[PDB]
Write a protein that binds this ligand. Structure first.
Ligand SMILES: [Cl-]
Ligand SMILES: [Cl-]
Ligand SMILES: [Cl-]
Lengths: 220, 218
């Protein structure tokens, strides 16, 4: 992986500033940009604006043919080329930032489609005899920024059904990405909006320092 | 009352029986249709063929305007009316069958879009001052038919990452659907394909018997 950070924006509203997770992300990005070395570049994929191919009849057909050395059709060629772009972009980054609203206790549908683009055998993982293993075991880092109506840190039912987080941590650990943090801008339905924003802002500042490996300090 | 079984087909191939989960489902359906009474309507929604709106900018705008009493655009009306049809169909059923392949340890993306259509506050659940509670606690039944390359019943890593089942069970329990069964047509990557099919077949026949409440022993 290069000196490159990749933003994976899973918010249906893409760039709308009034989104809690988008506000927190923008605060993160401003903070991060101050601390990163000059060798670091940044890319962003917008899952609800950019083309992120869904697994359909055509993709399954393309994949079956590729496994038989068979020629692809025009549309099979075009979709797989885009999936290849998305995968190669993912592999090129050693720092990942996922931004999502938690709706209905799982990752956004388009984030599932994105997972379907980047979890590829012989590329990000491989099959063996006792199962499979991840191929990206080289010290990459992941930060998840999640805004939610409810609160998930009370070790109750909500904690148990937070499948967005459970799934993402699991999959990325599988791939080899073991440095994982989630910032929960949680309780937007029951807590003070300025309280949510300010608590999340502080955590993503600390995350920015960590990821950039810098410490920032001011006298009072 | 009209009893209704609703088939939620989450396979991208829709009707192609080269797919294990669809093969098993078709086997289930034939057995069930032989056992049900004349008070039983069967309907099917194909998530990869029928229109299943995903939550996007337009849907969010529509929902905001709805919660304000603001008039919807022609486009916002179109999506919300389709989402309404999907939700009313879901609520009208008392038996559910979900058919899915396991791709990447979670529900198919279109099945998430479907969940986003059917989990609606004041409709299938409601908020309290305590938290949340389902509104469908009335003896409904759910059967999941899931095909997978790996085997998930060994209480190992695979069991720990079976988020398709974990999520679906959790969500439908929450809604009030506590009568839940999953049939795993599993190990397609490692077992004899005839063994996989035959084991799954036996399981769905027994499921069909349980759901129709007509057991025929030989
Ligand atoms: Cl948000
Ligand atoms: Cl299948
Ligand atoms: Cl179970």
């Amino acid at each position: 992986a290069m000196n490159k950070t990749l933003i994976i924006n899973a918010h249906p509203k893409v760039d709308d500033t009034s989104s809690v997770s988008i506000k927190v992300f923008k605060h993160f990005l401003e903070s991060y940009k101050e601390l990163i070395s000059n060798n670091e570049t940044i890319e962003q994929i917008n899952l609800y604006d950019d083309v992120v191919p869904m697994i359909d009849k055509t993709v399954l057909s393309a994949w079956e043919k590729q496994g038989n050395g068979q020629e692809l059709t025009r549309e099979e060629q075009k979709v797989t080329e885009r999936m290849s772009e998305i995968l190669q972009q993912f592999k090129s980054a050693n720092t990942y930032v996922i931004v999502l609203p938690l709706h209905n206790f799982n990752i956004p549908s388009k984030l599932k489609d994105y997972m379907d683009n980047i979890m590829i055998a012989r590329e990000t993982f491989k099959y063996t005899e006792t199962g499979s293993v991840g191929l990206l075991k080289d010290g990459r880092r992941m930060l998840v920024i999640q805004a939610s109506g409810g609160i998930y840190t009370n070790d109750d039912w909500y904690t148990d059904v937070e499948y967005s987080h459970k799934y993402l941590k699991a999959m990325f650990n599988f791939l080899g990405i073991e440095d994982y943090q989630i910032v929960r801008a949680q309780g937007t339905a029951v807590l003070d909006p300025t309280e949510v924003l300010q608590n999340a802002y502080k955590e993503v500042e600390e995350a920015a320092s960590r990821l950039a490996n810098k410490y920032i300090f001011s006298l009072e």
